[PDB]
Amino acid sequence: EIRAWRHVFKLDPNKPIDDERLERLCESGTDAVIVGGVTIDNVLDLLARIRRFSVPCALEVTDVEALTPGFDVYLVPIVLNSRQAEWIIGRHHEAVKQYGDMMNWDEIAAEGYCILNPECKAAKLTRADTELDVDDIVAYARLAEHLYKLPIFYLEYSGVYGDPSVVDKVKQALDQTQLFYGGGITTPEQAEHMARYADTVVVGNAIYDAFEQALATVAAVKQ
Amino acid sequence: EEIRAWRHVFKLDPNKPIDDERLERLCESGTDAVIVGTIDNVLDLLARIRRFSVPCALEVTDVEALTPGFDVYLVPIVLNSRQAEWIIGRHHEAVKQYGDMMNWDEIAAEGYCILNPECKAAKLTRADTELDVDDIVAYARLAEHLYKLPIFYLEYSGVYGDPSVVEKVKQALDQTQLFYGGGITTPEQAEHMARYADTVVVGNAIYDAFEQALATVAAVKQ
């Protein structure tokens, strides 16, 4: 169950990670490892290596081409602040049309993304409106919680460390919907601060850029 | 209200005059609910409906707020719209302005799949109506297992759909309730859609063929 996740690592399947690092990462105490791009073979190869360990393993499906059976959870982004229906339901429709019959709905959890960094690749691809004040962001969180009833609302700051006060304000609006935070977490203090408000804190880039610090984020959140 | 129990509902257009006689027969018909689809005029119609014992719902299509006094507020989300404003845009605007004083316990989302291109709703929302049964089933799954909406709404407004298609959609849904609306003018048409749809919606027929529209209730109930 995702509700228990407090710290998760996110691995880029196009980025290499040696076996000794993968071991240290998977046995670090993190609650889950998310594979997030991407080819189907590389996704399967990485999964097989993770399965050496007992850590829950999830796939974040950003493109149907890399959709792979065998994961514990399928995290499905909905870009709530996108200007294009494509990134809100369109691509989802295409994927569900083709693969819906083989999907186990118990393993699928939608993530109501609110992409907040304009300089990020995700923002540009999805045509996200990042010019948002806290009230805008709060409105999205409330939509996720009450109207769409998504399992997850996800504040995505990508390569920048977000505003902890915004994360705190969003949390107040949420309840049944879980609050995920991602963005520029490199130090344990950064991890700890966001973890005070976010249900679940996601650590990605630091894995490749500052591995030892990335490992330290676990205890900072979980202790 | 426990909307899962609804089998038959009447939908009234507040811009179309309805006399007290027909309103009363409708409200006392045994229908599970009367859905209302100027603010002082909506309130007037509400008050007239309140003289009886039938649940009254407001389907909200404009940013906002919600006119107070209804038992249930129904919020359409047009899943097959090609524009984000009909899926999240206007909903975001509304929640931003009025979200601090909204009672979500009285609000139910309707995952709409608009299936008649000739209607105003389809044209306004830029709905993709050219959908095969697989397309519609895909929307039904999105409504229940990605989005988690209590209602998936097949809207053929004016035209009578294929009951076989409605059967397939129902077979794809689990906990999400299937509403059907479209061209129901006879009790036979109502009963046949009612064996697959959880809830059938009778609208137009109220105005041009009242006796037959009234007869749709018993057809569904029996």
Coordinates of all heavy atoms in Angstrom, one line a residue, chain A residues 52-113, unseen atoms left out:
Chain A
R52 N 15.9 -8.7 -6.9 CA 16.9 -9.3 -5.9 C 16.5 -8.9 -4.5 O 16.9 -9.6 -3.5 CB 18.3 -8.8 -6.2 CG 19.4 -9.5 -5.4 CD 20.8 -9.0 -5.7 NE 21.3 -9.4 -7.0 CZ 21.9 -10.6 -7.3 NH1 22.1 -11.4 -6.3 NH2 22.3 -10.8 -8.5
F53 N 15.9 -7.8 -4.3 CA 15.5 -7.2 -3.0 C 14.0 -7.2 -2.8 O 13.3 -7.4 -3.7 CB 16.2 -5.8 -2.9 CG 17.6 -5.8 -3.4 CD1 17.9 -5.3 -4.6 CD2 18.6 -6.3 -2.6 CE1 19.2 -5.3 -5.0 CE2 19.9 -6.3 -3.0 CZ 20.2 -5.8 -4.2
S54 N 13.6 -7.0 -1.6 CA 12.2 -7.1 -1.2 C 11.4 -5.8 -1.3 O 10.2 -5.8 -1.2 CB 12.0 -7.7 0.2 OG 12.8 -7.0 1.1
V55 N 12.2 -4.7 -1.6 CA 11.6 -3.4 -1.7 C 10.5 -3.3 -2.7 O 10.6 -3.8 -3.9 CB 12.7 -2.3 -1.9 CG1 13.4 -2.5 -3.3 CG2 12.2 -0.9 -1.7
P56 N 9.4 -2.6 -2.4 CA 8.3 -2.5 -3.4 C 8.8 -1.7 -4.6 O 9.7 -0.8 -4.4 CB 7.3 -1.6 -2.6 CG 7.5 -1.9 -1.2 CD 9.0 -2.2 -1.0
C57 N 8.4 -2.1 -5.8 CA 8.9 -1.5 -7.0 C 7.7 -1.1 -7.9 O 6.8 -1.9 -8.2 CB 9.8 -2.5 -7.8 SG 10.6 -1.7 -9.2
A58 N 7.7 0.2 -8.2 CA 6.7 0.8 -9.0 C 7.2 1.3 -10.3 O 8.4 1.6 -10.5 CB 6.0 1.9 -8.2
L59 N 6.3 1.4 -11.3 CA 6.6 2.0 -12.6 C 5.8 3.2 -12.8 O 4.6 3.2 -12.7 CB 6.4 1.0 -13.7 CG 6.6 1.5 -15.1 CD1 8.1 1.8 -15.4 CD2 6.0 0.6 -16.2
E60 N 6.5 4.3 -13.1 CA 5.7 5.5 -13.5 C 5.6 5.6 -15.0 O 6.6 5.7 -15.7 CB 6.4 6.8 -12.9 CG 5.5 8.0 -13.0 CD 6.2 9.3 -12.3 OE1 7.3 9.6 -12.7 OE2 5.5 9.8 -11.5
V61 N 4.4 5.4 -15.5 CA 4.1 5.3 -16.9 C 3.9 6.7 -17.5 O 2.8 7.3 -17.4 CB 2.9 4.5 -17.2 CG1 2.9 4.1 -18.7 CG2 2.9 3.2 -16.3
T62 N 5.0 7.3 -18.2 CA 4.8 8.6 -18.8 C 4.6 8.4 -20.3 O 4.3 9.3 -21.0 CB 6.1 9.4 -18.6 OG1 7.3 8.7 -18.9 CG2 6.1 9.9 -17.1
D63 N 4.9 7.2 -20.8 CA 4.7 6.8 -22.2 C 4.3 5.4 -22.3 O 4.9 4.5 -21.7 CB 5.9 7.1 -23.1
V64 N 3.2 5.1 -23.1 CA 2.7 3.7 -23.2 C 3.7 2.7 -23.8 O 3.6 1.5 -23.6 CB 1.4 3.8 -24.1 CG1 1.7 4.0 -25.6 CG2 0.6 2.5 -23.9
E65 N 4.7 3.2 -24.6 CA 5.6 2.4 -25.3 C 6.5 1.6 -24.3 O 7.0 0.5 -24.6 CB 6.5 3.2 -26.2
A66 N 6.6 2.0 -23.1 CA 7.4 1.3 -22.1 C 6.6 0.7 -20.9 O 7.1 0.3 -19.9 CB 8.5 2.3 -21.4
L67 N 5.3 0.6 -21.2 CA 4.4 -0.1 -20.2 C 4.7 -1.6 -20.1 O 4.6 -2.3 -21.0 CB 2.9 0.1 -20.6 CG 1.9 -0.6 -19.7 CD1 2.0 -0.1 -18.3 CD2 0.5 -0.4 -20.3
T68 N 5.0 -2.0 -18.9 CA 5.6 -3.3 -18.6 C 4.9 -4.0 -17.5 O 4.8 -3.5 -16.4 CB 7.1 -3.1 -18.2 OG1 7.8 -2.5 -19.3 CG2 7.7 -4.5 -18.0
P69 N 4.4 -5.3 -17.7 CA 3.9 -6.0 -16.6 C 5.0 -6.4 -15.6 O 6.1 -6.4 -16.0 CB 3.3 -7.3 -17.3 CG 3.3 -7.0 -18.7 CD 4.4 -6.0 -19.0
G70 N 4.6 -6.7 -14.4 CA 5.5 -7.2 -13.4 C 5.8 -6.3 -12.2 O 6.5 -6.7 -11.3
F71 N 5.3 -5.1 -12.2 CA 5.5 -4.1 -11.1 C 4.5 -4.3 -10.0 O 3.4 -4.9 -10.3 CB 5.6 -2.7 -11.7 CG 6.8 -2.4 -12.4 CD1 6.9 -2.6 -13.8 CD2 7.9 -1.8 -11.8 CE1 8.1 -2.4 -14.5 CE2 9.1 -1.5 -12.5 CZ 9.2 -1.8 -13.8
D72 N 4.8 -3.8 -8.8 CA 3.9 -3.8 -7.7 C 2.8 -2.7 -7.9 O 1.7 -2.9 -7.4 CB 4.6 -3.7 -6.4 CG 5.6 -4.8 -6.1 OD1 5.3 -5.9 -6.5 OD2 6.7 -4.5 -5.6
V73 N 3.2 -1.6 -8.5 CA 2.3 -0.4 -8.6 C 2.6 0.2 -9.9 O 3.7 0.3 -10.3 CB 2.5 0.6 -7.4 CG1 1.8 1.9 -7.7 CG2 2.1 0.0 -6.1
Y74 N 1.5 0.7 -10.5 CA 1.7 1.6 -11.7 C 1.2 3.0 -11.4 O 0.0 3.2 -11.1 CB 0.9 1.0 -12.9 CG 1.5 -0.3 -13.3 CD1 1.2 -1.5 -12.6 CD2 2.5 -0.4 -14.3 CE1 1.7 -2.7 -13.0 CE2 3.0 -1.6 -14.7 CZ 2.7 -2.8 -14.0 OH 3.3 -3.9 -14.4
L75 N 2.2 3.9 -11.4 CA 1.9 5.3 -11.0 C 1.6 6.0 -12.4 O 2.5 6.1 -13.2 CB 3.0 5.9 -10.3 CG 3.3 5.3 -8.9 CD1 4.6 5.8 -8.3 CD2 2.1 5.7 -7.9
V76 N 0.4 6.6 -12.5 CA 0.0 7.2 -13.8 C -0.2 8.7 -13.6 O -1.2 9.2 -13.0 CB -1.3 6.6 -14.3 CG1 -1.5 7.1 -15.7 CG2 -1.1 5.0 -14.3
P77 N 0.7 9.5 -14.2 CA 0.6 11.0 -14.1 C -0.6 11.5 -14.9 O -0.8 11.1 -16.1 CB 1.9 11.5 -14.7 CG 2.9 10.3 -14.6 CD 2.0 9.1 -14.8
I78 N -1.3 12.4 -14.3 CA -2.3 13.3 -15.0 C -1.7 14.7 -14.7 O -1.6 15.1 -13.6 CB -3.7 13.2 -14.3 CG1 -4.2 11.7 -14.5 CG2 -4.6 14.2 -14.9 CD1 -5.5 11.5 -13.8
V79 N -1.4 15.4 -15.8 CA -0.9 16.8 -15.6 C -2.0 17.8 -15.5 O -2.5 18.3 -16.5 CB 0.1 17.2 -16.8 CG1 0.8 18.5 -16.3 CG2 1.1 16.1 -17.0
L80 N -2.4 18.0 -14.2 CA -3.6 18.8 -13.9 C -3.5 20.2 -14.5 O -4.5 20.8 -15.0 CB -3.9 18.8 -12.4 CG -4.1 17.5 -11.7 CD1 -4.3 17.7 -10.2 CD2 -5.4 16.8 -12.3
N81 N -2.4 20.8 -14.4 CA -2.2 22.2 -14.9 C -1.7 22.3 -16.4 O -1.3 23.3 -16.8 CB -1.3 23.0 -14.0 CG 0.1 22.4 -13.8 OD1 0.3 21.2 -13.8 ND2 1.1 23.3 -13.6
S82 N -1.9 21.2 -17.1 CA -1.6 21.2 -18.6 C -2.7 22.0 -19.3 O -3.9 21.9 -19.0 CB -1.4 19.8 -19.1 OG -1.3 19.8 -20.5
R83 N -2.3 22.7 -20.4 CA -3.3 23.4 -21.2 C -3.9 22.4 -22.3 O -4.8 22.8 -23.0 CB -2.6 24.5 -21.9 CG -2.0 25.6 -21.0 CD -1.4 26.7 -21.7 NE -0.8 27.7 -20.8 CZ 0.5 27.7 -20.4 NH1 1.3 26.8 -20.9 NH2 0.9 28.7 -19.6
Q84 N -3.3 21.2 -22.4 CA -3.7 20.3 -23.4 C -4.4 19.0 -22.9 O -3.8 18.4 -22.0 CB -2.4 19.9 -24.3 CG -1.7 21.0 -24.9 CD -2.6 21.8 -25.9 OE1 -3.4 21.2 -26.6 NE2 -2.5 23.1 -25.9
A85 N -5.5 18.7 -23.5 CA -6.3 17.5 -23.0 C -5.5 16.2 -23.2 O -5.8 15.3 -22.4 CB -7.6 17.5 -23.8
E86 N -4.6 16.2 -24.1 CA -3.7 15.1 -24.3 C -3.0 14.6 -23.1 O -2.9 13.4 -22.9 CB -2.6 15.6 -25.4 CG -1.5 14.6 -25.7 CD -0.5 15.2 -26.6 OE1 -0.6 16.3 -26.9 OE2 0.5 14.4 -26.9
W87 N -2.6 15.5 -22.2 CA -1.8 15.2 -21.0 C -2.6 15.0 -19.8 O -2.1 14.8 -18.7 CB -0.7 16.3 -20.8 CG 0.2 16.4 -22.0 CD1 0.1 17.4 -22.9 CD2 1.2 15.5 -22.4 NE1 1.1 17.2 -23.9 CE2 1.8 16.1 -23.6 CE3 1.8 14.4 -21.9 CZ2 2.8 15.5 -24.2 CZ3 2.8 13.8 -22.5 CH2 3.3 14.3 -23.7
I88 N -4.0 15.2 -20.0 CA -4.9 15.1 -18.9 C -5.7 13.8 -19.0 O -6.1 13.2 -18.0 CB -5.9 16.3 -18.9 CG1 -5.1 17.6 -18.7 CG2 -6.9 16.2 -17.8 CD1 -5.9 18.9 -18.8
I89 N -6.0 13.4 -20.3 CA -6.8 12.2 -20.5 C -6.5 11.5 -21.8 O -6.7 10.3 -22.0 CB -8.3 12.5 -20.3 CG1 -9.1 11.2 -20.2 CG2 -8.8 13.3 -21.5 CD1 -10.5 11.3 -19.6
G90 N -6.1 12.3 -22.8 CA -5.9 11.8 -24.2 C -5.0 10.6 -24.3 O -5.4 9.6 -24.9
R91 N -3.8 10.8 -23.9 CA -2.8 9.7 -24.0 C -3.2 8.5 -23.1 O -3.1 7.3 -23.5 CB -1.4 10.1 -23.6 CG -0.7 10.9 -24.7 CD 0.5 11.7 -24.3 NE 1.1 12.4 -25.4 CZ 2.3 12.2 -25.9 NH1 3.0 11.2 -25.4 NH2 2.7 12.9 -26.9
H92 N -3.9 8.8 -22.0 CA -4.4 7.8 -21.1 C -5.5 6.9 -21.8 O -5.5 5.7 -21.6 CB -5.0 8.5 -19.8 CG -4.1 9.5 -19.2 ND1 -3.8 10.7 -19.8 CD2 -3.4 9.4 -18.1 CE1 -3.0 11.4 -19.0 NE2 -2.7 10.6 -17.9
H93 N -6.3 7.6 -22.5 CA -7.4 6.9 -23.3 C -6.8 5.9 -24.3 O -7.2 4.8 -24.3 CB -8.3 7.9 -24.0 CG -9.4 7.3 -24.7 ND1 -9.4 6.9 -26.1 CD2 -10.7 6.9 -24.3 CE1 -10.5 6.4 -26.4 NE2 -11.3 6.4 -25.3
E94 N -5.8 6.4 -25.1 CA -5.1 5.5 -26.0 C -4.5 4.3 -25.3 O -4.7 3.1 -25.8 CB -4.0 6.3 -26.7
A95 N -3.8 4.5 -24.2 CA -3.2 3.4 -23.5 C -4.2 2.4 -22.9 O -4.1 1.2 -23.0 CB -2.3 3.9 -22.4
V96 N -5.3 2.9 -22.3 CA -6.3 2.1 -21.7 C -7.1 1.3 -22.8 O -7.5 0.2 -22.6 CB -7.3 2.9 -20.8 CG1 -8.5 2.1 -20.4 CG2 -6.5 3.4 -19.6
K97 N -7.3 2.0 -24.0 CA -7.9 1.3 -25.1 C -7.2 0.0 -25.4 O -7.7 -1.1 -25.5 CB -8.1 2.2 -26.3 CG -9.0 1.6 -27.4 CD -9.2 2.5 -28.6 CE -10.0 1.9 -29.6 NZ -10.3 2.8 -30.8
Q98 N -5.8 0.2 -25.6 CA -5.0 -1.0 -26.0 C -4.7 -2.0 -24.9 O -4.9 -3.2 -25.2 CB -3.7 -0.5 -26.6 CG -2.8 -1.6 -27.1 CD -1.6 -1.2 -27.8 OE1 -1.2 0.0 -27.8 NE2 -0.9 -2.2 -28.5
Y99 N -4.4 -1.5 -23.8 CA -4.0 -2.4 -22.7 C -4.9 -2.6 -21.5 O -4.6 -3.3 -20.6 CB -2.6 -2.0 -22.2 CG -1.5 -2.0 -23.2 CD1 -1.1 -0.8 -23.8 CD2 -0.9 -3.1 -23.6 CE1 -0.1 -0.8 -24.8 CE2 0.1 -3.2 -24.6 CZ 0.5 -2.0 -25.2 OH 1.4 -2.0 -26.2
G100 N -6.1 -2.0 -21.6 CA -7.1 -2.0 -20.5 C -7.5 -3.4 -20.1 O -7.7 -3.7 -18.9
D101 N -7.6 -4.4 -21.1 CA -8.1 -5.7 -20.8 C -7.1 -6.5 -19.9 O -7.5 -7.4 -19.2 CB -8.4 -6.5 -22.0 CG -9.7 -5.9 -22.7 OD1 -10.6 -5.5 -22.0 OD2 -9.7 -6.0 -24.0
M102 N -5.8 -6.1 -20.0 CA -4.8 -6.8 -19.2 C -4.3 -6.1 -18.0 O -3.3 -6.4 -17.3 CB -3.6 -7.2 -20.1 CG -2.7 -6.0 -20.5 SD -1.3 -6.5 -21.5 CE -0.3 -7.4 -20.3
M103 N -5.0 -5.0 -17.7 CA -4.6 -4.2 -16.5 C -5.3 -4.7 -15.2 O -6.5 -5.1 -15.3 CB -5.0 -2.7 -16.7 CG -4.0 -2.0 -17.6 SD -4.5 -0.3 -17.9 CE -3.2 0.2 -19.1
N104 N -4.6 -4.7 -14.2 CA -5.1 -5.0 -12.8 C -5.3 -3.7 -12.1 O -4.4 -3.1 -11.7 CB -4.1 -5.9 -12.1 CG -4.6 -6.4 -10.7 OD1 -5.2 -5.6 -10.0 ND2 -4.4 -7.6 -10.4
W105 N -6.6 -3.3 -12.0 CA -6.9 -1.9 -11.5 C -6.4 -1.7 -10.1 O -6.1 -0.6 -9.7 CB -8.4 -1.6 -11.6 CG -8.9 -1.9 -13.0 CD1 -9.9 -2.8 -13.3 CD2 -8.5 -1.2 -14.2 NE1 -10.1 -2.7 -14.7 CE2 -9.3 -1.8 -15.3 CE3 -7.6 -0.2 -14.5 CZ2 -9.1 -1.4 -16.6 CZ3 -7.5 0.2 -15.8 CH2 -8.2 -0.4 -16.9
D106 N -6.2 -2.8 -9.3 CA -5.8 -2.7 -7.9 C -4.3 -2.2 -7.9 O -3.8 -1.7 -6.8 CB -5.9 -4.0 -7.2
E107 N -3.6 -2.3 -9.0 CA -2.2 -1.9 -9.1 C -2.0 -0.5 -9.6 O -0.8 -0.1 -9.7 CB -1.4 -3.0 -9.9 CG -1.6 -4.4 -9.4 CD -0.9 -5.4 -10.3 OE1 -0.6 -5.1 -11.5 OE2 -0.5 -6.5 -9.7
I108 N -3.1 0.1 -10.0 CA -3.0 1.4 -10.8 C -3.4 2.5 -9.9 O -4.5 2.5 -9.3 CB -3.8 1.3 -12.0 CG1 -3.2 0.2 -13.0 CG2 -3.8 2.7 -12.7 CD1 -4.0 -0.1 -14.2
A109 N -2.5 3.5 -9.8 CA -2.8 4.7 -9.0 C -2.5 6.0 -9.8 O -1.3 6.2 -10.1 CB -2.0 4.7 -7.7
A110 N -3.5 6.8 -10.0 CA -3.3 8.1 -10.7 C -2.6 9.1 -9.9 O -2.8 9.2 -8.7 CB -4.7 8.6 -11.2
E111 N -1.7 9.9 -10.5 CA -1.0 10.9 -9.8 C -1.4 12.3 -10.4 O -1.1 12.5 -11.6 CB 0.5 10.8 -9.9 CG 1.1 9.5 -9.5 CD 2.6 9.4 -9.8 OE1 2.9 9.4 -11.0 OE2 3.4 9.3 -8.9
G112 N -2.2 13.1 -9.6 CA -2.5 14.4 -10.1 C -1.4 15.3 -9.9 O -1.1 15.9 -8.9
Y113 N -0.6 15.5 -11.0 CA 0.6 16.3 -11.0 C 0.2 17.8 -11.1 O -0.7 18.1 -11.8 CB 1.5 15.9 -12.3 CG 2.6 15.0 -12.0 CD1 2.4 13.6 -11.8 CD2 3.9 15.5 -11.9 CE1 3.5 12.8 -11.6 CE2 5.0 14.6 -11.7 CZ 4.8 13.2 -11.5 OH 5.8 12.4 -11.2

